[PDB]
Scaffold this active site. Structure first.
Site, PDB file in Angstrom:
ATOM      1  N   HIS A  29    -101.066  84.597 100.171  1.00 53.46           N
ATOM      2  CA  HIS A  29    -100.208  85.765 100.297  1.00 53.46           C
ATOM      3  C   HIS A  29    -100.488  86.486 101.618  1.00 53.46           C
ATOM      4  O   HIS A  29    -101.657  86.711 101.961  1.00 53.46           O
ATOM      5  CB  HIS A  29    -100.450  86.689  99.090  1.00 53.46           C
ATOM      6  CG  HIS A  29     -99.817  88.035  99.207  1.00 53.46           C
ATOM      7  ND1 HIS A  29    -100.553  89.185  99.378  1.00 53.46           N
ATOM      8  CD2 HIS A  29     -98.518  88.423  99.158  1.00 53.46           C
ATOM      9  CE1 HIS A  29     -99.739  90.225  99.428  1.00 53.46           C
ATOM     10  NE2 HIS A  29     -98.497  89.789  99.306  1.00 53.46           N
ATOM     11  N   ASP A  30     -99.425  86.841 102.349  1.00 47.88           N
ATOM     12  CA  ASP A  30     -99.545  87.488 103.669  1.00 47.88           C
ATOM     13  C   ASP A  30    -100.541  86.725 104.550  1.00 47.88           C
ATOM     14  O   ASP A  30    -101.524  87.283 105.041  1.00 47.88           O
ATOM     15  CB  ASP A  30     -99.981  88.951 103.526  1.00 47.88           C
ATOM     16  CG  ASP A  30     -98.812  89.895 103.234  1.00 47.88           C
ATOM     17  OD1 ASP A  30     -97.768  89.806 103.913  1.00 47.88           O
ATOM     18  OD2 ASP A  30     -98.951  90.740 102.327  1.00 47.88           O
ATOM     19  N   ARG A  66     -94.754  86.486 107.239  1.00 48.78           N
ATOM     20  CA  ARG A  66     -93.888  87.643 107.424  1.00 48.78           C
ATOM     21  C   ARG A  66     -93.746  87.936 108.908  1.00 48.78           C
ATOM     22  O   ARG A  66     -94.716  87.846 109.655  1.00 48.78           O
ATOM     23  CB  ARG A  66     -94.442  88.869 106.706  1.00 48.78           C
ATOM     24  CG  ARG A  66     -94.942  88.623 105.289  1.00 48.78           C
ATOM     25  CD  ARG A  66     -93.825  88.450 104.267  1.00 48.78           C
ATOM     26  NE  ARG A  66     -94.425  88.335 102.950  1.00 48.78           N
ATOM     27  CZ  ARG A  66     -94.744  89.378 102.192  1.00 48.78           C
ATOM     28  NH1 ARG A  66     -94.456  90.605 102.606  1.00 48.78           N
ATOM     29  NH2 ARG A  66     -95.335  89.188 101.020  1.00 48.78           N
ATOM     30  N   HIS A  79     -97.663  92.456 108.699  1.00 51.13           N
ATOM     31  CA  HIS A  79     -97.700  92.876 107.308  1.00 51.13           C
ATOM     32  C   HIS A  79     -96.995  94.225 107.285  1.00 51.13           C
ATOM     33  O   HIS A  79     -97.592  95.253 107.628  1.00 51.13           O
ATOM     34  CB  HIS A  79     -99.137  92.974 106.786  1.00 51.13           C
ATOM     35  CG  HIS A  79     -99.239  93.363 105.343  1.00 51.13           C
ATOM     36  ND1 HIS A  79    -100.308  92.997 104.553  1.00 51.13           N
ATOM     37  CD2 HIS A  79     -98.413  94.082 104.544  1.00 51.13           C
ATOM     38  CE1 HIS A  79    -100.137  93.473 103.334  1.00 51.13           C
ATOM     39  NE2 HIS A  79     -98.994  94.135 103.299  1.00 51.13           N
ATOM     40  N   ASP A 280    -104.455  86.186  97.273  1.00 53.67           N
ATOM     41  CA  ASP A 280    -105.163  86.846  98.365  1.00 53.67           C
ATOM     42  C   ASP A 280    -106.557  86.227  98.513  1.00 53.67           C
ATOM     43  O   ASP A 280    -107.124  85.709  97.540  1.00 53.67           O
ATOM     44  CB  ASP A 280    -105.282  88.356  98.123  1.00 53.67           C
ATOM     45  CG  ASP A 280    -103.979  89.106  98.357  1.00 53.67           C
ATOM     46  OD1 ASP A 280    -103.088  88.599  99.077  1.00 53.67           O
ATOM     47  OD2 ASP A 280    -103.847  90.214  97.806  1.00 53.67           O
TER      48      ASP A 280
HETATM   49  O1  LIG Z   1     -95.675  89.790  97.364  1.00 53.05           O
HETATM   50  C1  LIG Z   1     -95.037  91.002  97.604  1.00 53.05           C
HETATM   51  C2  LIG Z   1     -93.507  90.820  97.741  1.00 53.05           C
HETATM   52  O2  LIG Z   1     -93.165  89.507  98.102  1.00 53.05           O
HETATM   53  C3  LIG Z   1     -92.731  91.971  98.466  1.00 53.05           C
HETATM   54  O3  LIG Z   1     -91.581  91.620  99.206  1.00 53.05           O
HETATM   55  C4  LIG Z   1     -93.618  92.876  99.314  1.00 53.05           C
HETATM   56  O4  LIG Z   1     -92.983  94.075  99.560  1.00 53.05           O
HETATM   57  C5  LIG Z   1     -95.010  93.104  98.760  1.00 53.05           C
HETATM   58  O5  LIG Z   1     -95.735  93.891  99.642  1.00 53.05           O
HETATM   59  C6  LIG Z   1     -95.526  91.699  98.869  1.00 53.05           C
HETATM   60  O6  LIG Z   1     -96.796  91.567  99.297  1.00 53.05           O
END
Ligand SMILES: O[C@H]1[C@H](O)[C@@H](O)[C@H](O)[C@@H](O)[C@H]1O
Length: 302
Positions: A29-30, A66, A79, A280
């Site tokens: 994630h991210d 992102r 982010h 994460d």
């Molecule tokens: O997993 C989540 C999600 O995909 C959203 O679009 C985001 O706004 C959150 O912050 C993110 O981390």
């Protein structure tokens, strides 16, 4: 002997007749947030401490990228408003390097616009991604460009498969690659058809949940995937969650509890279908606790 003992090449050990949807895949994630060093920002915006290459060598195959259009030919990795100190080219260069060394893996790359473009930008986010990255000479063959809405490992070996969270796109290959894109529900568990009805996307993304609600939401979707053999269903399960407003409420501290709890749950399910689990601090180990990435890998029935 376990798959997780050689996480660099675990996909190479599967039947490549499998659809990617049927593979239990660790995601981060991210993913690009590993660059963050500021303590207060890191509490809420840092989600990883390993770089792209190390994540890949640790067995991660789904990447949550992102972006922010920072110039008419450039996407910066973000982010939200926070700039992660590199451009999209770094990720793709790393992915290429890795897939060259490990040519029987495949990578799924989620792409999403996380922030408004610089004021000098004149093109849409999707256009910049499509023209200067997807159709960049350096990456054009790197991306999956097939017409299968449900590609197999065999079709995607050595390739990056687009997972489209940009909204509509004129790109024609990948999950959600059509002019409708993916209808994404905020802070929810949801399901929606993608790729002109060819797939049913089932997502748990309740990122605002408190701890117990989030763990339950993950387990609920895990339980659905366990009894669902449908190749045309795709499961994306986010273990990641929003931080609190303090050092001991960081994304890291949440992951240090959620990741072992879910890893234990998967371990004690034997080999069964889990879907794609996006975490994460992928690869972050805690002595005496089960590792989420390893257990996702090992949950693949062989
Ligand atoms: O997993 C989540 C999600 O995909 C959203 O679009 C985001 O706004 C959150 O912050 C993110 O981390």
């Amino acid at each position: 002997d376990s798959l997780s003992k050689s996480p660099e090449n675990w996909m190479s050990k599967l039947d490549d007749g499998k659809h990617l949807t049927e593979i239990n895949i660790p995601g981060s994630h991210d993913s690009g947030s590993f660059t963050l060093k500021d303590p207060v920002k890191s509490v809420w915006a840092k989600t990883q401490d390993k770089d792209y290459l190390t994540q890949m060598k640790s067995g991660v195959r789904f990447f949550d990228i992102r972006g922010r259009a920072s110039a008419d030919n450039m996407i910066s990795v973000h982010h939200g408003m926070v700039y992660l100190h590199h451009e999209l080219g770094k990720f793709l260069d790393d992915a290429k390097y890795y897939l060259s060394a490990y040519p029987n893996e495949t990578i799924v790359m989620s792409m999403k616009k996380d922030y408004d473009s610089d004021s000098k930008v004149t093109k849409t986010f999707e256009e910049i991604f499509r023209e200067y990255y997807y159709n960049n000479p350096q990456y054009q063959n790197l991306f999956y460009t097939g017409s299968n809405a449900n590609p197999t490992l065999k079709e995607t070996k050595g390739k990056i498969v687009l997972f489209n969270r940009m909204g509509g796109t004129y790109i024609k290959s990948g999950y959600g690659a059509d002019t409708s894109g993916i209808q994404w529900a905020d802070n929810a568990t949801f399901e929606t058809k993608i790729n002109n009805g060819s797939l049913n996307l089932k997502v748990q993304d309740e990122y605002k949940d408190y701890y117990d609600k989030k763990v339950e939401a993950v387990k609920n979707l895990l339980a659905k995937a366990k009894t669902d053999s449908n190749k045309d269903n795709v499961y994306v399960n986010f273990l990641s969650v929003a931080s609190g407003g303090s050092a001991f409420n960081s994304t890291y501290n949440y992951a240090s509890f959620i990741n072992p709890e879910i890893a234990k749950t998967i371990k004690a399910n034997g080999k069964a279908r889990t879907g794609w689990l996006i975490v994460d601090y992928a690869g972050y180990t805690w002595p005496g606790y089960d590792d989420i990435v390893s257990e996702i890998i090992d949950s693949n029935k062989l």
